[PDB]
Amino acid sequence: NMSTTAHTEPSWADLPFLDFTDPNFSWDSPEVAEAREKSWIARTPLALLVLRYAEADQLARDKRLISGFRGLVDMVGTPEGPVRDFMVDFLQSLDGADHRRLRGLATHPFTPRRITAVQPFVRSTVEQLIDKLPQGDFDFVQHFPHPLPALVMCQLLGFPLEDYDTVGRLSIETNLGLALSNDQDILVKVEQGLGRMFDYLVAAIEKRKVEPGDDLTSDIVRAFHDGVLDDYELRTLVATVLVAGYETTNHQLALAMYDFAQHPDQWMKIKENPELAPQAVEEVLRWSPTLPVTATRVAAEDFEVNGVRIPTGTPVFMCAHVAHRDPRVFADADRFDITVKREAPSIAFGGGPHFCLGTALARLELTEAVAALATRLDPPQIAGEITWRHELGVAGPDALPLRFGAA
């Protein structure tokens, strides 16, 4: 598909080739930096890959580039079932009128007022998790970046807080990163992963249809009562928020510690001036985004951008990780430095109408965590095997063993 298109497009002839599906591929490879230097966009086996900051934002907003997933499902050849249904009907797959309708129902808790309102819960959750941290070598994931976003997710969606372990486990086991797989045995455990999480969600939704609260599930239920969306759209929307809201926030917090394990001097600088936390979080998002590939799109028509023809059906992926090290935008881009007040933000949350719904909540959880950890604890250092997810498009430890302080 990408190979047949390449043989038909003269504007693709000088584009560098990057095989990110390869098991030994690194985003920090000198091959990748060369490709960005040579071209704003690269050829991959699955998609065109945008490597520069300016164009990554441009194309993430371009109306001629439809929001991905529907195109990737047909090309792979996913059979009809619970997996395909979710991958074609969930928020990231929709565009136009249906997208604005369904997204608008889940936008209220992410307004600047509601982020302020939920902030005390986030702060006290962080505080409590630090209080009960082990003194020696421990998995940072198990003891902090798993419980934190899980508890916040339970608070947001109106689940009992005691279910944070179950809720987080139900979010991981869905395995959306392996939903576009060609294998059947893989697609079966994705089907069963979704089913089990939907079993929890359906119970919580019908509970809200009789006794609603101040939570997000209650608000989407109000829209169901008003006939804005049906029952299928209800549980799909609540599922999307949940799955998206846990795993990447988890991984991002782990990546934050991994970064400061390499730069303990900068950790101490946050300890001195805790106000550096938001700037530090932005540097973590720039240097090590949990999603190195952010916005995924498919061309809905033949069009041209910056000298490159993009035919209908061509997948285009925005490579935020590489765009974050663009020297056209970032000074000393290949160095982790939290002390630099940067004009341009990270683009870790995509762009366009599909931009991360939980952007502000994600930044809140990251800031509250980094501020409190750096104030209260000594710099982290790695204490064993980091189990990186060998999954295409996602960066993050499944387990991060560490200690805070040498002694």
Ligand X SMILES: COc1ccc([C@](O)(c2cncnc2)C2CC2)cc1
What residues between 80 and 139 interact with ligand X by CB under 6 A? Answer: 92
Quote the crossing angle between the two packed helices 164-172 and 184-208, to the nearest 10°. Answer: 140
Q: Smallest distance from the beta carbon of 340 to Cl ion, in angstroms?
A: 5
| Nearest to 142, CA basis, from 155, 152, 132, 154 | 132
Which option in ligand HEM, ligand X, Cl ion, none does residue 293 bind, with CB closer than 5 to 8 A by kind? ligand X
Does residue 243 belong to the site contacting ligand X (CB under 6 A)? yes
Nearer to ligand HEM, 267 or 317 (CB): 317
Residue 154 labeled ligand binder: no
Do the Cβ atoms of 316 and 310 come closer than 8 Å? yes
Q: Smallest distance from the beta carbon of 110 to ligand HEM, in angstroms?
A: 7
Residue 263 labeled ligand binder: no
Please tell me what DSSP assigns to residue 111. Answer: S
238-249 per-residue burial string, b: 16 or more CB within 10 A, e: under 16: bbbbbbbbbbbb
Q: Smallest distance from the beta carbon of 142 to ligand X, in angstroms?
A: 20
Nearer to ligand HEM, 15 or 237 (CB): 237
Give 401's strand partners: 139
Amino acid at residue number 224: F
Please tell me what DSSP assigns to residue 299. Answer: E
Nearer to Cl ion, 26 or 116 (CB): 26
Reduced to 3 states (helix: H, G, I; strand: E, B; else coil), residue 55 is helix
Residue 77 labeled ligand binder: no
What residues between 175 and 234 interact with ligand X by CB under 6 A? Answer: 176
Residue in this structure with the two tokens 């990447």, named with its chain if needed: 248
Q: Smallest distance from the beta carbon of 7 to ligand HEM, in angstroms?
A: 29
- By CB under 5 A, name the one of 330, 364, 372, 373 that touches Cl ion: 330
Which option in Cl ion, ligand X, ligand HEM, none does residue 36 bind, with CB closer than 5 to 8 A by kind? Cl ion
Nearer to ligand X, 59 or 243 (CB): 243
| Nearest to 223, CA basis, from 234, 212, 213 | 234
Count of residues touching Cl ion (by CB under 5 A): 5
State the DSSP string of 122-168.
HHHHHHHHHHT--SSSEEHHHHTTTHHHHHHHHHHHT--GGGHHHHH
Does residue 78 belong to the site contacting ligand X (CB under 6 A)? no
Does residue 322 belong to the site contacting ligand HEM (CB under 6 A)? no
Does residue 65 belong to the site contacting ligand X (CB under 6 A)? no
Quote the crossing angle between the two packed helices 359-376 and 231-262, to the nearest 10°. Answer: 30
Residue in this structure with the two tokens 């994705």, named with its chain if needed: 190
Region binding ligand HEM by CB under 6 A among candidate stretches 41-49, 228-236, 265-273, 346-354: 346-354
Number of helices (H), then strands (E), in the chain: 17, 10
Do the Cβ atoms of 16 and 42 come closer than 8 Å? yes
Region binding ligand X by CB under 6 A among candidate stretches 74-82, 101-109, 213-221, 290-298: 290-298
Does residue 286 belong to the site contacting Cl ion (CB under 5 A)? no
Nearer to ligand HEM, 254 or 362 (CB): 362
Please tell me what DSSP assigns to residue 295. Answer: E
Nearer to Cl ion, 36 or 251 (CB): 36
Cβ-in-10-Å burial (0-12, 13-18, 19+) of 186 comes to middle
Residue 354 labeled ligand binder: yes
Residue 213 labeled ligand binder: no
Compose the 360-399 pattern: x for residues touching ligand X by CB under 6 A, - for all others.
Answer: ---------------------------------x------
Does residue 36 belong to the site contacting Cl ion (CB under 5 A)? yes
Within 7-66, residue ranges assigned H as helices are 30-38, 53-61
Instruction: Enumerate binding residues for Cl ion (CB under 5 A).
Output: 36-37, 330-331, 342
Instruction: Enumerate binding residues for ligand X (CB under 6 A).
Output: 92, 176, 243-244, 248, 291, 293, 296, 356, 393
